[PDB]
Design an enzyme around this catalytic site. Sequence first.
Site, PDB file in Angstrom:
ATOM      1  N   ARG C 103     -44.430 101.900  57.861  1.00 12.86           N
ATOM      2  CA  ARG C 103     -45.850 102.193  57.906  1.00 12.86           C
ATOM      3  C   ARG C 103     -45.935 103.621  58.382  1.00 12.86           C
ATOM      4  NH1 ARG C 103     -50.677 104.444  57.860  1.00 12.86           N
ATOM      5  NH2 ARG C 103     -52.366 103.187  58.776  1.00 12.86           N
ATOM      6  N   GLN C 133     -51.170  94.876  50.350  1.00 14.58           N
ATOM      7  CA  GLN C 133     -52.455  94.222  50.447  1.00 14.58           C
ATOM      8  C   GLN C 133     -52.962  93.824  49.063  1.00 14.58           C
ATOM      9  OE1 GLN C 133     -54.408  93.434  53.225  1.00 14.58           O
ATOM     10  NE2 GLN C 133     -55.494  92.331  51.663  1.00 14.58           N
ATOM     11  N   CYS C 260     -59.835  93.337  53.175  1.00  9.79           N
ATOM     12  CA  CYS C 260     -58.666  93.603  54.013  1.00  9.79           C
ATOM     13  C   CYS C 260     -59.229  93.790  55.404  1.00  9.79           C
ATOM     14  CB  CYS C 260     -57.928  94.853  53.562  1.00  9.79           C
ATOM     15  SG  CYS C 260     -56.417  95.116  54.518  1.00  9.79           S
ATOM     16  N   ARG C 288     -50.678  87.899  52.629  1.00 10.32           N
ATOM     17  CA  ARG C 288     -49.786  88.976  53.013  1.00 10.32           C
ATOM     18  C   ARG C 288     -48.376  88.457  53.241  1.00 10.32           C
ATOM     19  NH1 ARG C 288     -52.571  93.409  55.288  1.00 10.32           N
ATOM     20  NH2 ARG C 288     -50.488  94.293  55.665  1.00 10.32           N
TER      21      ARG C 288
HETATM   22 CL   LIG Z   1     -53.343  96.003  56.887  1.00  6.99          CL
END
Ligand SMILES: [Cl-]
Lengths: 302, 302, 302
Positions: C103, C133, C260, C288
Amino acid sequence: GIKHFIDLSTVPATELRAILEDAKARKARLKAGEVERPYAGKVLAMIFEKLSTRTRVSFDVGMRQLGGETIMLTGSEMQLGRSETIADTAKVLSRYVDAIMIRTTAHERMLELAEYATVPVINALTDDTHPCQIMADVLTYEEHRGPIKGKTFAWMGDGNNVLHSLVEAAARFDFNVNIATPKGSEPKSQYIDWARANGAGIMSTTDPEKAASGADCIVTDTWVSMGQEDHARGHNVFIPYQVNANLMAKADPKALFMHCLPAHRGEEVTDEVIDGPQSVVFDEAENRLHAQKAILAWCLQD
Amino acid sequence: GIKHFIDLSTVPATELRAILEDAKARKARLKAGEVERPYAGKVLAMIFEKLSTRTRVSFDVGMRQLGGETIMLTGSEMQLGRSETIADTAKVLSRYVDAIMIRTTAHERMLELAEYATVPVINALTDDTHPCQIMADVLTYEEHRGPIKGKTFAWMGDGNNVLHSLVEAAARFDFNVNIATPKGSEPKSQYIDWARANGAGIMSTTDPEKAASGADCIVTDTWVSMGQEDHARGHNVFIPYQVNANLMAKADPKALFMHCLPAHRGEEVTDEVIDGPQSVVFDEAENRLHAQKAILAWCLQD
Amino acid sequence: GIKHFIDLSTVPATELRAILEDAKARKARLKAGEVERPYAGKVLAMIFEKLSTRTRVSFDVGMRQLGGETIMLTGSEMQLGRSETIADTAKVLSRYVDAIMIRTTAHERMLELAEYATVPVINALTDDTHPCQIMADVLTYEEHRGPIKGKTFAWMGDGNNVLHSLVEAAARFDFNVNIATPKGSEPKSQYIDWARANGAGIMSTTDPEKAASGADCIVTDTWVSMGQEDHARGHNVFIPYQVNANLMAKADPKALFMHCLPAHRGEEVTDEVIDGPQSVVFDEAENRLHAQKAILAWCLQD
Ligand SMILES: [Cl-]
Ligand SMILES: [Cl-]
Ligand SMILES: [Cl-]
């Protein structure tokens, strides 16, 4: 009786050799695709009083490949001595886990943990020694070049935790270390003194070419790790000790280049050496996993 | 229907007893060398809004010994209510994990998590109660001394989360608690009131000797945990309540000494008591693991 | 050759479809009570340069359900490029683990990690795209409504990482996206341009009713995520784009609502929509886990 792994100078030579040979055996089984769990149900606490992600990852993966469990604890989650005596921490953690890895600054808190623990304590590294890195280095050397006995390693720059353990290893594995440092033939080192008394050949010089000549492995580390916090000053006292192609050409033609990562290209080593054909730095890094697995297995046995 | 573990006062006595007996059964299998995985594929989220490493380690190891998985989350990774409603957090975490352990400050956020979760929520501890510590204590008592029914525990100093759960346990396990506090026979406590209404014998006094006399277990905790942030003030209001050899000699000759760690020798307890032959503090600490395993198993069942 | 998962626009449509179908297959086995370990001995490093707990938990549980291991690393434990070159980090981490989830903020550091890694690199999310997502969203859509081909999704508000990946998905899965934004029919978007060139139908409008009319799925996200840091300003430019009952009534009667998480009720969506019968936000969140399992399996294969 407890099988602590504190330093190379606190474990017998024959046991260090047994650990290295087991590291090779387990690595062979792993590369052959075997997934095994000899230490299923064993837990390793990993106490980091200072950050070292490569140490964390290599121990974590290694323990898991033995079938064990790990628990990552920081300095902020655990500083030995803060909220209770170290004895109390040791005795309680001993009721929950099967071994304790610690990365501390000073040696003393690791030794007190080991005094009171009833499970093995492992020196992941300290400011003063790095036995696990040097076990990885000896493993790497032997994998690439065969028996290390009688070989000569040349260290460039000044002392640090890695060099201290390297000179201990020279004693335990019966090899030689040449050390080129601005300190010259007057290093005043407890590690050198112990190593010489225990079978190592150690030569200290100001001259990199004298240390490197005919050597089987050239080793260095960052200017910061070797005691120069200033970049320009570091550049200043250490630039003559840089590992570059000219220096490597003075060594044995089959010499290896080693460096406990991280490295800074263009400072202690040039791109062409660390990314060239004599470099084994990434194999050396991989061997943190394989060496530390064998240390864990040795500590956990019986 | 969901088997939350919020407090001793929210779980039936027969179920608390079943959990204790299962803790003993599972511990016996473990000590006999058995490694088993009844809850393979189950995941425990561990939410810590305040640091408690001994709580983390004991739950983590316990869940793993059941064959499950754990995920460690901090307050900074998760503060209930910060980035979304607690309901939304609960419902999403319920889609990923099988139980949620929480260490919170105030009770209310734990209860709201439990309201909206569709998996069990477990009170690891709060500022006001500590059911898991007291399950460990009752387990330890019975292991050393047999059935706890009708026995008398004496608490020295003032209230805190541990004492609150202890008086609830006196009701649920049919024993007595004598409490020596500067507050005297006027403690004004919701916990005492509930315990008395539910089967406990509770006596409150200013006099440590009166509380300790003939008791089967003497318990205390740190001056800070008992509401004195100042060391000299703490020393001041609590020094008469110190657990020392003279106090232990007033108790039953077979009395145990207990303390939810960490402890401060020379403050609430002397070295000679906590490190002496009546102390069970380290067994008590170990039993966090064994008691919490049985709580997890109870929550995860069916 | 290495099976990186960087963006929907960097993986072939047929492979994205294969991943979705595998996600459904594995989910079915899981719900049927099967616990399996096809990727026993595989390790996923999870590098978080910015906090995302729902991303962490969903990847962690997913990897464990495949029988693998995970290692959680923060920005403070690892910021790519800080202590050594990204190339060096990539090559060392490749010696220890089998895949790397990241990330990051900006895309470039993820791409450099992938350039030098010899294990797959997975985009957990970035500031600019969120492929995982959107894989979860397409999975959720098909579970509730069948084949997504030719359907129309309507996005309310302005662009963000999720919308960018949604328009890529419109190309890869052959569906349409209507986008109602204050930017109008002049969005100036590299993602829209790529999607149109690769099979998507995209319509951009200022008018929420025009976008929503007859749509099969209505999607939005928070005012902050859509570029309005100010609450009153956010309220100001985005209130006309709110997803409320009146807007949902313009869509197909069988329309779904997606978001989301986290969501802010009363801002971008009302309680009655997100907690009403057209909402699939919690199933979307669950997915997810199931979608990311299939991405991990795809990356780890062979
Ligand atoms: Cl997220
Ligand atoms: Cl290191
Ligand atoms: Cl505690």
